[PDB]
């Protein structure tokens, strides 16, 4: 890294106000219909959101036992922003090592724990359930057939992006990025805190973003210094944050933290979602870092819309019968 993080954390020059601070009860479908989920949202308490979380003193060792000691986990090497892998037992050891003896800074942001014991312990906001494409568009019998709890593409029956556990040590930094497929994100701060930088997905900004990704020379440029307006903002424990489609953000970890969050596409900002997918196509993002089965999901979305409105199905007979069987449950 070539720029100075301590200063990015210190300056008041990131003074834009993008966030709507909001009551949980106000984040409903009508809100979605009227505003198109265009603005980052913060809920300073969980009231009326519909969320469930684990025991407040849940530790990374408890995460390890729910998902398995031997499970392979993607771990980011903070100083290179490149990925490596270890087992959860090894991650746990690293995470439990006292701060001074930790040789390197490592971050885990990509542990998806659906179809493990942990998954029932976490519930996302009710409103997200109502709009998530995975829940509302993907054929249900395929989703329910999923047994594999890792993200192995060949075992994946549906886009397995709903429930992530993030475990970051003090000093962790994730550089500016847009989430895959222009998914929106919900992030709950269970323990610790996070600092986000937010840059709005204007046409100009997304062009700077794409150009920055194509440059390669990225540890050099702090992208928040290139745009007209950027909001730095601190989430504290108990807060729930929602990032809209296409928002460019970077995140710093000031204290040891544990976050539960998830990604979702929805029907109210499709054009941004398509725009992001095609940035990924152009900059050659490898498949592993992209939303699985994206165009497949898009096809199913069209079919659901036509069916729910006009009652003409464009699913195979077999698929209609499977759907019918679950309606009968």
């Amino acid at each position: 890294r070539t720029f100075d993080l301590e200063e990015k954390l210190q300056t008041n020059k990131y003074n834009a106000n993008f966030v709507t601070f909001m009551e949980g009860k106000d984040f409903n479908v009508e809100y979605i219909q009227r505003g198109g989920l265009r603005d980052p949202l913060i809920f300073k308490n969980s009231d009326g959101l519909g969320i469930k979380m684990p025991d407040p003193d849940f530790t990374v060792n408890d995460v390890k036992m729910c998902v398995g000691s031997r499970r392979m986990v993607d771990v980011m090497d903070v100083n290179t922003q490149k990925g490596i892998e270890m087992t959860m037992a090894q991650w746990t050891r690293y995470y439990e090592t006292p701060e001074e003896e930790r040789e390197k800074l490592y971050n885990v942001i990509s542990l998806e724990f659906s179809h493990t014991r942990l998954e029932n312990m976490v519930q996302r906001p009710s409103t997200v359930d109502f709009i998530d494409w995975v829940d509302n568009m993907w054929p249900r019998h395929l989703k329910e057939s999923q047994t594999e709890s890792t993200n192995a593409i060949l075992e994946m029956q549906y886009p397995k992006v709903q429930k992530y556990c993030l475990m970051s040590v003090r000093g962790c930094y994730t550089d500016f990025h847009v989430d895959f497929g222009g998914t929106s994100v919900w992030y709950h701060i269970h323990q610790g805190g996070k600092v986000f930088w937010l840059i709005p997905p204007t046409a100009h900004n997304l062009e700077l973003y794409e150009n920055w990704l194509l440059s390669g020379k990225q540890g050099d440029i702090f992208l928040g210094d290139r745009v007209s307006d950027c909001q730095r903002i601190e989430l504290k424990q108990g807060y729930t944050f929602v990032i809209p489609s296409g928002w460019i953000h970077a995140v710093y970890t000031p204290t040891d933290t544990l976050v539960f969050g998830g990604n979702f596409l929805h029907s109210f900002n499709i054009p941004m979602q398509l725009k992001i997918y095609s940035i990924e196509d152009r900059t050659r993002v490898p498949n592993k870092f992209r939303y699985p089965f994206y165009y497949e999901m898009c096809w199913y979305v069209l079919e659901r819309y036509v069916y729910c409105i006009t009652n003409r199905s464009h699913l195979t007979k077999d698929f209609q019968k499977e759907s019918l069987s679950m309606d009968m449950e």
């Binding site: 993607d74 942001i109 890792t150 993200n151 593409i153 992006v161 895959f180 990604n263």
Partner: peptide, 10 residues
């Protein structure tokens, strides 16, 4: 070496 998808990372 099983391929994966849905991996969050910049």
């Amino acid at each position: 070496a099983p391929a994966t998808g849905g991996v969050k990372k910049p």
